[PDB]
């Protein structure tokens, strides 16, 4: 599913991402935009063989199990397929654990290079929340 900007912002807000561990809702909307362009079925095979899954492109090397990644630590304790649903619950829950790690949102290259340092609140402006 390809989310609409405000549709996703509202969903993420309901899923408790606004100000989660210090990150305003805009950061998450922006991260999803640049990681997958709001596409929950997004998938990218990495160089090391691992694969990024979902709207937040969570990697199978550390976070989920896709049964084809030798290193896979499956820190989020879920099959990567759960991250390809139009129901963002699984991705959000995993994202929360990820961000609870030392790197914070820095775990997402797209957020580090396209969102950090900018007016991320712009991503939720005009949305009724």
């Amino acid at each position: 599913k390809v989310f609409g900007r405000c549709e996703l912002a509202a969903a993420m807000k309901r899923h408790g991402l606004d100000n989660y561990r210090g990150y305003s809702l805009g950061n998450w909307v922006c991260a999803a935009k640049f990681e997958s362009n709001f596409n929950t079925q997004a998938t990218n095979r990495n160089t090391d063989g691992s694969t990024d899954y979902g709207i937040l492109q969570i990697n199978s090397r550390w976070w989920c199990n896709d049964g084809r990644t030798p290193g896979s630590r499956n820190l989020c304790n879920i099959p990567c397929s759960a991250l390809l649903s139009s129901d963002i619950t699984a991705s959000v829950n995993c994202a929360k654990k990820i961000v609870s790690d030392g790197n914070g949102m820095n775990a997402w290259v797209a957020w580090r290079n396209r969102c950090k340092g900018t007016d991320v609140q712009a991503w939720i402006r005009g949305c009724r929340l």
Epitope: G22, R73, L75, K96, D101, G102
Partner: antibody, heavy 113, light 107 residues
């Protein structure tokens, strides 16, 4: 089946350093986030801190830098270190997975002046 | 830190009766509120996570609702084994904090 188990001194004197360990079975210590929580007798619950997969730690400011949480991947366990203990530190100490899904049974630690 | 306040401190319930426990956050925490049940001499057991998500193995009579700063744990028809102290806990902000607890006891 996942099982956490706390172990350490049940009695100590003030100013001493509390050392506790939590051994895990049925799950890999290096494949998750782990924490410590305590409950003073007759009181509620207070988070002590947790350590994530990258080794980064988060400590409760209420402890005022007297706490250390570390991991011993070789023995699939993690520990808690609390310096300069006083009666205010008497409590049942629990270890648990970050997600809160699994908890140790807790260990009573009494600091006797 | 975010202050979590539970009410009532003690809740008397007759077996079979509905039980409603409240929890409030000093500031908005979205859906980052988890409920635990703690029986004497035992560690708290997670019942509900992220305000309303259920855990496998947990009786259907346990249900959580609410968002922002007001949350509720409902036991549709309390059974005698449900007597215990219940705690809410937020994970939106570090340090994570627990409410003061609600002691549910037989009436």
């Amino acid at each position: 089946q996942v099982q956490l188990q706390e172990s350490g001194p049940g009695l100590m004197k003030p100013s001493e350093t509390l050392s506790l360990t939590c051994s895990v079975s049925g799950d890999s210590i290096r494949s998750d986030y782990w924490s410590w929580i305590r409950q003073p007798p007759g009181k509620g619950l207070e988070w002590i801190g947790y350590v994530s997969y990258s080794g980064s730690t988060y400590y409760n400011p209420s402890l005022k830098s007297r706490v250390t949480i570390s991991v011993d991947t070789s023995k699939n366990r993690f520990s808690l270190k609390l310096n300069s203990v006083t009666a205010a530190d008497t409590a049942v100490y629990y270890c648990a997975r970050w997600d809160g899904d699994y908890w140790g049974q807790g260990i009573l630690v009494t600091v006797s002046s | 830190e975010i202050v979590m306040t539970q009410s009532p401190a003690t809740l008397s319930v007759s077996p079979g009766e509905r039980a409603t426990l409240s929890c409030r956050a000093s500031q908005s925490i979205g859906n980052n509120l988890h409920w635990y049940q703690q029986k004497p001499g035992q560690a708290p057991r997670l019942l509900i996570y992220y305000a309303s998500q259920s855990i496998s193995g947990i009786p259907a009579r346990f249900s959580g609702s609410g968002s922002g700063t007001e949350f509720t744990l409902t036991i549709s028809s309390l059974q005698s084994e449900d007597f215990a102290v219940y705690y809410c806990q937020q994970s939106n902000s570090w340090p994570y904090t627990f409410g003061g607890g609600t002691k549910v006891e037989i009436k």
